[PDB]
């Protein structure tokens, strides 16, 4: 034969082929050699995740193309999201290598799962088919089940894995039932930009079976994004999983699911916009209302960050709701880019605090300013950026998200977003209020015996690449959007 048609198409997924090669090389070296070294695992994970971006940036100017016979679409929209996934993995590897090593467990398996979830998240970003919109998030969800229970000994992690596996088998089967309904009442078409035509060809675009597919797809996607009553999987899993994996599932899962939701609600479901618009409006209003209200009654930091994430996802949903006309998708990014730094910094501070301290309760965060002023300053900056406080990234991100909402006439959505943002100050201020307690009687012995130690550690560099971003991107919110309105 020629092996050429696939060879020229195989260069289009070369950034993912780099991840696959790094995965295989890491696995082969782990199997071949008995001894284990932290620096080599660090090097291979980093050089796998900094060569994919090197190849992806070299592929930015290239023409958009649909390769592997209607299976992989490369254009401007998915490239940004793939870069976001790679950035999340790159800033989560230092979060993971220290944490899993301090738990005395095998780390090559953890890096393998993270790299596979990144590989399955990059494929979900451009997945121009219905089979690969199922297989790729099953390359992510299965690894997420393998993660978050990698602890394997804590009684919390087993229950978290049970809940995650059962609820994500409940979803991603409703999603595929919707895929089957959409594929049946279309004429046997599965490519994304070929089933609206197939629907007209069979004249079933107003069939009652199309509403079932839309509802099932929206439910199966809103499970992964976790807005609205599809949110219950989030806090328990966020409360009973190791911190690096939950940070990864906080930033990497929302990016891939946002990309899939944007490419599944606009390309194959534009004829029925008046239905999924209402579904997303309900899904967002309920998300902000019931993610900002419950977060103010939280005694655990990871669970509070879970309710925080299910609150901030509703702000991003407005970008899908307004549509591509009044910016819209250009406001999904330039806020998800913000959200990544916000959450990864506020999780890196939690990682360091828990490792040096050994706790997760919020009440043990008292008096951290006296012990480690740098960590308290960084965590406070991350939390204030999370609350949309003025000189930090969240404020400009939220006003960008609300400008397009007001421009599209969605006064109710913007009003609910602003009211929930007001509610979203009491938390992200409660933690700081604890952090600035000089009362020695209210200071828990968890932070009384706290050693900062005269070494830098990797997470400090990883969140110094972040805290300086959530504050100094506030002038650079003109460079980012001109890369995000350029896509269409």
């Amino acid at each position: 034969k020629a092996f050429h048609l696939l060879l020229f198409d195989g260069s289009l997924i070369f950034p993912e082929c780099i991840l696959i090669f790094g995965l295989i090389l890491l696995l082969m070296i782990d199997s071949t050699s008995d001894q284990k070294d932290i620096p080599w695992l660090y090097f291979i994970s980093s050089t796998s995740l900094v060569m994919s971006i090197t190849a992806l940036l070299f592929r930015w100017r290239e023409e958009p193309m649909i390769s592997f016979s209607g299976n992989f679409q490369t254009n401007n929209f998915n490239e940004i999201f793939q870069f976001l996934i790679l950035l999340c993995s790159t800033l989560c590897i230092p979060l993971s290598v220290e944490y899993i090593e301090c738990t005395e467990m095998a780390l090559t398996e953890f890096l393998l799962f993270i790299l596979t979830a990144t590989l399955g998240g990059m494929f979900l970003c451009g997945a121009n088919d219905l089979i690969t919109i199922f297989v790729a998030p099953e390359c992510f969800s299965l690894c997420s089940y393998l993660l978050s229970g990698y602890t394997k000994k804590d009684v919390r992690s087993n229950e978290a894995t049970t809940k995650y596996l059962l609820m994500g088998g409940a979803s991603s089967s409703i999603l595929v039932h919707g895929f089957s309904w959409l594929y049946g009442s279309s004429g046997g078409e599965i490519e994304l930009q070929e089933i609206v035509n197939g629907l007209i060809n069979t004249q079933m675009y107003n069939s009652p079976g199309i509403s079932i597919a839309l509802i099932f797809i929206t439910v199966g996607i809103g499970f992964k994004l976790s807005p609205a009553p599809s949110h219950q999987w989030t806090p328990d899993v966020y409360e009973g999983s190791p911190t690096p994996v939950v940070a990864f599932l906080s930033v990497t899962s929302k990016v891939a699911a946002s990309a899939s939701a944007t490419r599944i609600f606009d390309i194959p479901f534009y004829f029925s916009s008046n239905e999924w618009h209402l579904l997303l409006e309900i899904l967002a209003i309920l998300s902000m209302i019931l993610g900002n209200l419950i977060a103010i009654t939280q005694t655990s930091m990871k669970r509070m960050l879970a309710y925080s994430s299910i609150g901030q996802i509703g702000y991003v949903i407005i970008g899908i709701i307004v549509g591509d006309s009044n910016d819209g998708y250009a406001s999904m990014i330039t806020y998800m880019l913000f959200y990544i730094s916000m959450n990864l910094g506020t999780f890196a501070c939690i990682v360091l605090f828990g490792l040096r301290t050994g706790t997760d309760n919020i009440r043990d965060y008292a008096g951290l300013y006296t012990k480690d002023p740098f960590l308290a300053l960084s965590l406070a900056l991350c939390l204030l950026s999370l609350g949309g406080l003025p000189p930090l990234a969240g404020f400009f991100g939220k006003i960008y998200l609300f400008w397009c909402g007001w421009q599209a006439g969605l006064y109710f959505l913007v009003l609910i977003g602003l009211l929930t943002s007001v509610l979203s100050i009491y938390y992200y201020l409660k933690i700081i209020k604890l952090l600035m307690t000089g009362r020695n009687q209210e200071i828990t012995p968890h932070v009384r015996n706290y050693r900062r130690s005269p070494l830098r550690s990797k997470n400090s560099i990883e969140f110094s690449m972040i805290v300086c971003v959530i504050a100094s991107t506030i002038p650079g919110i003109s460079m980012n959007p001109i890369i995000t309105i350029a896509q269409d």
């Binding site: 799962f113 590989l119 494929f123 004429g187």
Partner: protein, 176 residues
């Protein structure tokens, strides 16, 4: 390329009754062993349905893979449970099951009010050009091989990566 009409419809009804019995056995048995054995009946009936439609390869794949899955399921249910417990025998009824029975009945009614209202034969006569097979590909398994090898390349390697990582995670998690 089908069975005689009345035979086909009778087989549909009979296999549907067997499938209903197997599923009800799955969702009404306390013992995971008994419900697994009912699941096996469901698997066999579904493979026979695949043979009925046109799927002579998908039926064999279903039989092989899902028979391995149920054998593993029975082994791990024997290994991870209490005594043999033939006395358990149709676990008791609570209010929490009664409300979900109503919810699932409503969901099934919503699905069947769409299935019974859509003319599925009308769609078939509109997709005429999708049913003109290539005359050289006599073997249906040959067509499925060609369209698995060429049309779906990216999922074909993605599933390999998924299987490898699933094997590694299953070994790492379940080890003592």
């Amino acid at each position: 390329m089908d069975l005689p009409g009345p035979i086909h419809d009778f087989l549909l009804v009979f296999l549907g009754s067997g499938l209903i019995l197997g599923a009800l056995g799955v969702v009404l048995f306390t013992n995971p062993i008994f419900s697994a054995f009912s699941l096996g009946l469901v698997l066999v009936c579904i493979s026979l349905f695949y043979i009925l439609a046109n799927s002579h390869f998908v039926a064999s794949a279903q039989l092989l893979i899902y028979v391995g899955a149920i054998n593993v399921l029975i082994i791990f249910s024997v290994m991870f449970m209490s005594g043999p417990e033939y006395d358990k025998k149709f676990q008791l009824w609570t209010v929490g099951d009664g409300v979900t029975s109503l919810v699932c009945i409503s969901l099934f009614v919503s699905l069947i009010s769409t299935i019974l209202n859509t003319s599925w034969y009308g769609i078939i006569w509109t997709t005429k050009s999708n049913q003109i097979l290539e005359q050289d590909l006599i073997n249906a398994s040959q067509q499925i091989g060609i369209h698995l090898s060429t049309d779906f390349f990216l999922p074909f390697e993605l599933i390999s990566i998924i299987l490898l990582v699933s094997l590694i995670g299953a070994i790492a998690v379940a080890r003592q």
